[PDB]
Amino acid sequence: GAPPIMGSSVYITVELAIAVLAILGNVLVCWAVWLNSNLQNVTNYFVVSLAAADILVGVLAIPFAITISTGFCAACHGCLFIACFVLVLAQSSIFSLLAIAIDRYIAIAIPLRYNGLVTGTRAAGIIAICWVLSFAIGLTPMLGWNNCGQPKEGKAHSQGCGEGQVACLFEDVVPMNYMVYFNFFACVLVPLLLMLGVYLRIFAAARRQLADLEDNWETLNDNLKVIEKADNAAQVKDALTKMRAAALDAQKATDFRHGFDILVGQIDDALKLANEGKVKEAQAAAEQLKTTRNAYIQKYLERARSTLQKEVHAAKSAAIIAGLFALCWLPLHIINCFTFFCPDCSHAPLWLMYLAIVLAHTNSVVNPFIYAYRIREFRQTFRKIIRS
Ligand SMILES: CC(C)CCC[C@@H](C)[C@H]1CC[C@H]2[C@@H]3CC=C4C[C@@H](O)CC[C@]4(C)[C@H]3CC[C@]12C
Numbered sequence: 001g002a003p004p005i006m007g008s009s010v011y012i013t014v015e016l017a018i019a020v021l022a023i024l025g026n027v028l029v030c031w032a033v034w035l036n037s038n039l040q041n042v043t044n045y046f047v048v049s050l051a052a053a054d055i056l057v058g059v060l061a062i063p064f065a066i067t068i069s070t071g072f073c074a075a076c077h078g079c080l081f082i083a084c085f086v087l088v089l090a091q092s093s094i095f096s097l098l099a100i101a102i103d104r105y106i107a108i109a110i111p112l113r114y115n116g117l118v119t120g121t122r123a124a125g126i127i128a129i130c131w132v133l134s135f136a137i138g139l140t141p142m143l144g145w146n147n148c149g150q151p152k153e154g155k156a157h158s159q160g161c162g163e164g165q166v167a168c169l170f171e172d173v174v175p176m177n178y179m180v181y182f183n184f185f186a187c188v189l190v191p192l193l194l195m196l197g198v199y200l201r202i203f204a205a206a207r208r209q210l211a212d213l214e215d216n217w218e219t220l221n222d223n224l225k226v227i228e229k230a231d232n233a234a235q236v237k238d239a240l241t242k243m244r245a246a247a248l249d250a251q252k253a254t255d256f257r258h259g260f261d262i263l264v265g266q267i268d269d270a271l272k273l274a275n276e277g278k279v280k281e282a283q284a285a286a287e288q289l290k291t292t293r294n295a296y297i298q299k300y301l302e303r304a305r306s307t308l309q310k311e312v313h314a315a316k317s318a319a320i321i322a323g324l325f326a327l328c329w330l331p332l333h334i335i336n337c338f339t340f341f342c343p344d345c346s347h348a349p350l351w352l353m354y355l356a357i358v359l360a361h362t363n364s365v366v367n368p369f370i371y372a373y374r375i376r377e378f379r380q381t382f383r384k385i386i387r388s
Pocket residue numbers: 073074075077078079081082
């Protein structure tokens with residue numbers, strides 16, 4: 001058995017490197033949101049709440065992980081806090097990820113009432129409530145659901161611990177059924193599955209709106225061909241009524257107002273000539289619609305299509321962050337399941353344990369890179385902060 005401090009030094013040095021990277025990167029995120037008013041929206045307030053949790057990982061959680069890896073002697077309830085505080089930060093991350101996904105669903109499904117519904121003052125209260133719940137969930141072992149009542153006395157006497165103290169080790173103070181049933185399944189697995197369903201609805205809503213824009217565009221062009229090769233006033237009237245309804249739908253479904261006023265007015269002109277039985281005069285009046293379509297309607301169709309694709313792009317960025325969190329945290333939770341569900345399986349090796357813990361801490365580093373690589377406003381702001 002090699003001296004423990006040797007393998008400890010590699011684990012401690014890697015953890016300190018992660019803390020430095022987590023603090024710097026996420027301080028840059030908060031500094032960007034504080035300075036740039038274009039980044040000051042409800043969605044980024046949860047981002048700052050998410051960066052706040054990751055900053056606290058480097059300042060407190062990682063030093064707590066280094067401390068509890070030594071097995072030092074401590075009072076059990078004080079040991080519980082050092083062991084469980086990272087669960088509070090992880091829970092706060094879950095609430096901030098679920099909130100971003102919900103905020104993005106509201107923006108894309110009901111954009112007409114998003115500004116009146118999702119305000120800044122309400123977002124601050126949600127962040128405050130989600131942090132209080134995160135403490136309640138993460139520090140639940142301190143409310144009684146712990147192993148403090150049954151200490152490993154032989155392990156404490158071998159390490160010179162005093163009376164009322166224990167060897168502070170995670171598995172000895174935090175019960176595994178809490179970590180598996182309460183923390184992982186209920187408070188981590190279920191919310192992540194909810195986020196997956198929310199993002200499925202977002203992308204499904206985005207795809208449905210883009211076929212609607214294209215379907216009203218084809219309906220506009222197809223009925224124009226029908227009018228040109230019609231042979232009676234009733235066929236011209238049938239296509240004009242379906243265009244007037246389709247034009248109106250675009251106006252509701254959202255210079256813009258003037259272009260549709262011309263389009264509906266020109267359809268009414270040809271509709272009146274069709275009801276009077278003047279077929280040739282209605283076809284010529286319907287030909288004027290192509291001028292309005294080229295100068296107004298097509299230009300609006302590429303802006304509406306451009307805005308939706310930007311909402312899809314922002315939605316994938318958010319989804320990536322959520323997926324990364326799961327990727328970074330699943331290994332640790334899966335190891336807990338093997339130990340809890342299979343007591344006959346051999347223990348997970350010590351090196352693999354600290355690899356999974358280090359992987360879970362690395363999630364506090366990755367977010368600021370995603371913003372830089374996927375969001376122009378954050379990346380531009382990062383450069384300004386750095387250069388200056
Ligand atoms: C505002 C921030 C920086 C304050 C940080 C407070 C932290 C560092 C404090 C608060 C509670 C403290 C713990 C409370 C009780 C005990 C029991 C004792 O037998 C060993 C130390 C131990 C385990 C303490 C370690 C340090 C501790 C975790």
